[PDB]
């Protein structure tokens, strides 16, 4: 899909809860989990616009109080083709 | 009043709004006679001899004194012809 | 009073145990209008984007926390300056209440279909027809 | 499309207007109409997430003023393999 | 013969009166009488749009007073192929 | 006879009394008894118009205070061939 | 005995108490138990008029405080032949 | 056994709680579960008179606070031979 | 596992939402959905006691405010063999 | 078992204490330890839902006062297949 | 099932009540009853952790007020292989 | 019968008085006498539930003032299949 | 009242409460 | 290891907690469990001095509050060759 | 374009918004995203001085309220040859 969902969290227990509630909710594919350093983990899902909005609204409510917490929940429905270069395609 | 037999229903989508939602039926004194339409106060099946009231009486029989009706089916005759 | 390993629900540990406390029964602890009035609402996006009906579940709505495609993100991108108020409009609708002269009156006699209760028909010169 | 849209109504007239508006609004397949009992009739649609969001909204707006009304309008973006067995596959 | 009229009523006695008023009012075919449950009975008719309008308007006035009365009177002039599948095809 | 007399009641005890009164009061055939749901039970009779009028009147006074009472008592002297199909043709 | 005694109740637990109380109270035969829907259950007994009068009075007093209670108690000493076709001949 | 124990409950979830408690407490046999309609479900258990008194008490307490709750609880130490024909013999 | 979890709800939409949340939250198999009548639908899951405790907690919270809501949520960690005959083994 | 228990702690000594506690306390398998960054270390332990609760509670208490302490203790009774790719399969 | 639940009581009347309650409450297997001496009787029941938490709580509540009462009620979710040599395999 | 009666007493003298009173006062069979240690004896009986209740009520009255006394008198109307392993089948 | 073996040991017996 | 770690406990349940804590916390080997009589149950371990010290402290803390409690917790760093005859060589 | 616009942000969710906001706002090419470490992520764009300026203002405004925020927003109208070697270049 073209939409991007991002759930930054302070810790990987909050990020794992977020990825579980984002994937389970809608047909969004978990394209990456990034250790941004400093303790910030960003779980990135890519799917159709509605699926990403439904998924990112579930992940956020789920990880809001897991561990340290949620830092950011952001949706970008189409992303400049140049930004697609700096976005993960499959999770490590 | 006139004894008449229902032949068919009549539908007019572009009808004055004062005719409400009341059904209309193509009655006739005998088959091959001049066809007329009567607002059906008493529900009537096609082929049944009915009794129809004309001026003024029809307006009140089918709704109110103002209802746009000069013919209304006041009843179904129990035995005819 | 039961010593040993505890599987009893807690707030330090987070996950499925916390959900629905006080609704569920059979647990070891227990045993031992949809759409907002139409007149009131004025949806931002009409049509299939109408948010008037409370549509529960995994819908495409976004809550408080979500930041993204709409709002400051769409409105900030391009600079803009609005410099004037709406100026009076010249249109048929606006001219509905234009000051009009007094209606022509008819003093004609004899049958002429001289109706005075209808719409203002006029005849050459501005007379009443 | 795997999403489920469901409109529960009191009566079948509201349900058939809900099912027409939902099918009319989007490319969603009507998979069932269920006489729940108690005078509740849940019409179930299935389609791509966005289609089901556009469909359910149209059906809810269409049926609220038809008959006794609407009890619920819900979307499930991905339904678990288990909930497929309690879901009608094609309508009756 | 592609238009649908439906008159839901609370009880069979109002609905039989509705179906009698509808079929007599216009050239429509009572395609079903459906016990929805909870005491709702829906008489559905299928005929041309003007015929369906006349039948449903006359049937609605007829059943308003009989018994517990009318719940709904609806005309769906064009029926989506998908909604046709949840619709009774002959009265049984 | 073609006339129909339908007495709906909130329970089977009121309907059995209504049926007894209708059949005893005039020459009508108890063509059917139907359980609509919600407690509604409609006893339908068929006979000539006068017989049906007398029968429905007797049934109504008889069942009004029996049990939860009468919902409707209706007479249709001539039922359409189309509504003949949704009517029971023999009691069970 | 050809009289009919009928006790409608709101639930089967009230109706079975009523059936037991009726057969034990007087010389009456439990011809049937019918689920009317809406929670209504009718127990039909049949015996001599005095037997049925005593059974229906005994079954009413017995079932009134069991569960939701009694909706109707009714006796019909002679039943028209027509009403017999809607009556349950044997309990099963 | 000769005794009957009936726990009528509003909803099936309270009825399965009642059934689990009774059959566990004393030596009784779930002989039927009946959907009486209107949300009423009656669980009938047959056992020895002492066994059916202990099962019904257990079931009534258990199902009281489960779901909508308990409509009625009843013990019929012996049922007239005639009420045996309206009674369920094995559960469905 | 032999544990039972049961979420009764008013309507099919609340129950289907409850079955999605229950199945997704924990390792439970959905053994049946039962229309109890009177507007009630039961959704029954069977799993190990910890998985069924977690499933019925997830379903109850998700369907509490979907449609008319949740009548009951109940865990029976072991069911008497007798209650197994009144439980649905596989769903429709 | 497919449940996931994760404990996040500030420092590796607290996490090793938590992992030993969890594996010893219940039937769970240590699947990995991840260095998140910023001094966060997450110990992941799979197993049956009931077993994974005991472990995460035992391991949470063990690291509560070791070193910097505990950031998060969390349980996910079922994990979506998409989140499996991000989770560590065996400990390194 | 490798978790161990164990209720010590003063007497075999308090212990047999506890064993019955524990075994009835969950899928646990009574592995032994030991006469510790001094009027102490330990009833040990194996099973999955969730089932042993249900069963031990049921046993404790049940035998607390039977006879002399409950000395202790303990759960061990996993037991070292060494301690498995001092634990009863089956009841003798 | 499957019901179990158990009278625990301090000493075999109170136990034999109670054992004789239980088997002389009801149709129960002495299935065993167990020395629990610590100066506790249990006399276990088995019969139908009413018989066991009368037997245990009679025995508890007989031994309350015989010797050291009565610790417990308990009735378990149905014992789980697993508890039947730790229960004596015949005395000596 | 109803005399019998059920009358005996009113407050001592525990377990299997019967119907009220 | 010739050190011995003895934890005597009132009851077997305080003694099985002690054995579990002891064997889990050190490279000790449960060598036996003794029912001393009067209630006392002595769990004995054999290991090195530091291992035995760690195991016994853990066991004492663990079983201190389980049941009746801890009678004694003793460590004998080297046991005389004569005492070996009175010590269990393997758990029986 | 030789001007460089750089937006440092605390996190990657704040940085993808700014890379997306800068690229969409003006004719700048996203040369790279660099993870500084410590939670710092820098998105670098290259364009004409006028285009880099609009883009940096747009990126600075966008990401300021996404996640932790903006650390630095800066424009270098001419970048020296030596600094080009420390600057990410390819749209990797």
Residue numbers in the entry:
A (entry chain C), D (entry chain M), E (entry chain G), F (entry chain L), G (entry chain J), H (entry chain K), ...: 6 to 97
B (entry chain H): 1 to 81
C (entry chain Y): 701 to 732, 773 to 869
M (entry chain X): 712 to 731
Give me lines lifted from the publication on this model.
The cryo-EM structures of T = 9, T = 9 Q = 12, T = 13, T = 16, and T = 19 shell assemblies were determined at 2.3-, 2.99-, 2.93-, 2.75-, and 3.04-Å resolution, respectively. In the T = 13 shell, only F3 (Arg712-Arg731), F4 (Arg701-His732), and F5 (Leu773-Gly869) were identified, whereas only F4 (Arg712-Arg731) and F5 (Leu773-Gly869) were determined in the T = 9 shell. Intriguingly, the smaller T = 9 shells involved only one conformation of CsoS2-C, whereas the second conformation of CsoS2 appeared in the larger T = 13, T = 16, and T = 19 shells. Further integration of a full set of shell proteins, which naturally yields diverse homo-oligomers and hetero-oligomers, enables diverse interaction modes between CsoS2-C and hexamers, thereby facilitating the assembly of larger midi-shells (T = 13, T = 16, and T = 19) with a maximal size of 54 nm.
